[PDB]
Design a protein around this nucleic acid. Structure first.
Length: 58
DNA sequence: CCGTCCCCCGCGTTTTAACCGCCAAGGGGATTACCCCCCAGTCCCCAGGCACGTGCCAGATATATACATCCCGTACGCACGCACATCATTCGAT
C-alpha cells in the first residue's frame, strides 16, 4: 500500500501489537526426520486395506 | 531322472544391549638400586661308556594240518495270486 510509509505503520503495528494479542508464530519439525517410511509398508498398508474389504471389488 | 516337501530365507517388528563417553582408583606393570650366590672356568682324576667279539640262544623263519568263513544252490516255508468249488444269493414258480 503506497498510502502510508513503513514508519507510523511499524508504529501502527506497535499500537496494533499493544491492542491485539501477539501472534503465535510457532514453527514445527515433526518427530520424524527421514527413513522409517518405506513405500512397501504403504503397499503393506494397502494390502491390509485390500484384504479387509477391497477383496469384493464392487 | 522324478519328484517330493520342507526348511531356510527374506523381510518385517521391537527389544535390547552393545556403544560411547565420561568418571574414578589403584592395582600393578615397569623401573632402580643392591648384592650375593651362582654359574663359568681350570685343574685333576677315573669309571662310565663305547667299540669289538662272542656265541649262543631263544628268538625268529619256514613247514603241515585243523578249523573257520564265504557263497550257491537248495529246498523249504509261506504268503502270495490265481483259480476253483462251494457257500451263498437271486430270479422264477410256487
Amino acid at each position: 500500500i503506497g498510502t502510508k510509509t513503513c514508519r507510523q505503520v511499524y508504529e501502527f503495528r506497535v499500537k496494533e501489537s499493544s491492542i491485539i494479542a501477539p501472534a503465535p508464530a510457532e514453527d514445527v519439525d515433526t518427530p520424524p526426520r527421514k527413513k522409517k517410511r518405506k513405500h512397501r509398508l504403504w503397499a503393506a498398508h494397502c494390502r491390509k486395506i485390500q484384504l479387509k474389504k477391497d477383496g469384493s471389488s464392487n
